[PDB]
Design a binder for this molecule. Structure first.
Ligand SMILES: CC[C@@H]1C(=O)N(C)c2cnc(Nc3ccc(C(=O)NC4CCN(C)CC4)cc3OC)nc2N1C1CCCC1
Ligand SMILES: CC[C@@H]1C(=O)N(C)c2cnc(Nc3ccc(C(=O)NC4CCN(C)CC4)cc3OC)nc2N1C1CCCC1
Lengths: 288, 296
């Protein structure tokens, strides 16, 4: 059973469980508000019984360690964590318009300026992480959250890692990323370049309204990733289709860096809206 | 010197040596493909000079005799054997994802459903053997092979024996099993129950990411087996830990039969994936704690 009111022995601050938001994988997530301040946050409550298997205790510890060290306006605000004997409580920024998964599911393909709007904010968030020697390793629609004003906030640092030294490549992952990069598939070792691959996969989905490689069965899906088999519809704009091709390459070193990515003709020469209307979640907007 | 093309005087069928797979104990193993069919197999090429010591000639002959009599979808396909003056050539099913040893070495401990996934297939393979009065006597990660689709195929029948009548107990082994059962250690005589012991040792390793009894030196390892000294981490699920305790008992008669084993709450009440993704060989997959079969 989960307590109605969540108490923090450390800072003597206490919260009240609100509406059920859903299961964040291994977690049970609710709206919460501080007893005194009345400020609303997104609680992430993990059974400590599931954090008994060390392999899972490791993941949880690293997630909080990387996320609590990060403050950027396109990264989910980490507002603290604490635990009792039964649960671990993680207090995060509440993003009132959920994630790009919900948008994608409602809207399918977006307009090119909408695609561009969200993608710049994602790249900006990701450029901050990379600069702070952090690889997310699991960027997907589901963990790219939208605040009230449809500002993109990168969250879910479950599979994220910290690069210790210049040149480091990683092998081991405490979980299976949504978008498997070729160098993760082949277990070749990987670095920052995995994040560019997923942004390429994310860019494709936003413009095409379907994932690039995903098929009925996983065996064909992974074979397509291995041989770099995908088709960009003839209806996609050249410049954008070019930037997708640049990102979705078998060779990690061949892909743009997050810094080069942001300076693509797609971003520099294309129209970026300053603000999107809230109708964009359900109906395609007019720009012209 | 090993011939580039392997010729069979009997059936006039001929093969071409492919990539080197590795040394299968006493053997030298390669990919091979038939000249006409172009079908790819796993060759096992034994120097006949090593099959000169009778004790070794006996093993080899019995291995081929037991294995060539067996056909099951969780047993390595035996596709024939032949010899020249220098070598004995054994043609087996090619399992393109090697063995559980490679998985274990990469992944260490697996998720409980992964453990369950492989274990059901192992028990099924072993239930077929037992039904055909065959004790494997050397089940280990290294000889539990994985085909393209991650189906488990039991191979390596080097220490395997044929039970002549029901109730018969055996003593002599022309080799040392990876997982020594207590009744083999004490030379008390043994039967089908040894195979359950190794599955218990295999189950433990898959869930814990380390062997139950193995230590630095062998003297302590064998003393632990003799006294039944092992510890199940507090993090293992009760039902699974219970089934391990049932299998890893000093008394062979106390252990489940391969038929009772398959019907354990671990298997019947636990979630079994129908298929694993190929990423499972390198990265742990995520499973819902509520995995119902009433949604996509
Ligand atoms: C805390 C975990 C994770 C995260 O990390 N952050 C940062 C987050 C920030 N903000 C939200 N916000 C909302 C999330 C879901 C909903 C929503 O509409 N929930 C309905 C509940 C009833 N159900 C039948 C249908 C869905 C509303 C949200 O804003 C109020 N969710 C977040 N999640 C998600 C929490 C559920 C999965 C993951
Ligand atoms: C025939 C002996 C025995 C057996 O009985 N069967 C049935 C078997 C079926 N299939 C395989 N398949 C493969 C085994 C290894 C590899 C592999 O990746 N080998 C690498 C070669 C390069 N080297 C630097 C590192 C090792 C690939 C395989 O499939 C393509 N091996 C089998 N073995 C094993 C063969 C040596 C140990 C035992």
């Amino acid at each position: 059973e989960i307590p109605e009111v969540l108490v923090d022995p450390r800072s003597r601050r206490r919260y009240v469980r609100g509406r059920f938001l859903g299961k964040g994988g291994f977690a049970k997530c609710f709206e919460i508000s501080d007893a005194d301040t009345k400020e609303v946050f997104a609680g992430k409550i993990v059974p400590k019984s599931l954090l008994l298997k060390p392999h899972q205790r490791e993941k949880m510890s690293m997630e909080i360690s990387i996320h609590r060290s990060l403050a950027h306006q396109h990264v989910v605000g980490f507002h603290g964590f604490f635990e009792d004997n039964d649960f671990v409580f993680v207090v995060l920024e509440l993003c009132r318009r959920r994630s790009l998964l919900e948008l994608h599911k409602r809207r399918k393909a977006l307009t090119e300026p909408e695609a561009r709007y969200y993608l710049r904010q994602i790249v900006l968030g990701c450029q901050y992480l990379h600069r702070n020697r952090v690889i997310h390793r699991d960027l997907k629609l589901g963990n790219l959250f939208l605040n009230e004003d449809l500002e993109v906030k990168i969250g879910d640092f479950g599979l994220a890692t910290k690069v210790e030294y210049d040149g480091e490549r990683k092998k081991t992952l405490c979980g299976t990323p949504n978008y498997i990069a070729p160098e993760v598939l082949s277990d070749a070792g990987h670095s920052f370049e995995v994040d560019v691959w997923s942004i390429g996969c994310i860019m494709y989905t936003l413009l095409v309204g379907k994932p690039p490689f995903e098929t009925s069965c996983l065996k064909e899906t992974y074979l397509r990733i291995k041989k770099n088999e995908y088709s960009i519809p003839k209806h996609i704009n050249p410049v954008a289709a070019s930037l997708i091709q640049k990102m979705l390459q078998t060779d990690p070193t061949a892909r743009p860096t997050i810094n080069e990515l942001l300076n693509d003709e797609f971003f520099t020469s294309g129209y970026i809206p300053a603000r999107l209307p809230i109708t964009c979640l359900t109906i395609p907007p007019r720009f012209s």
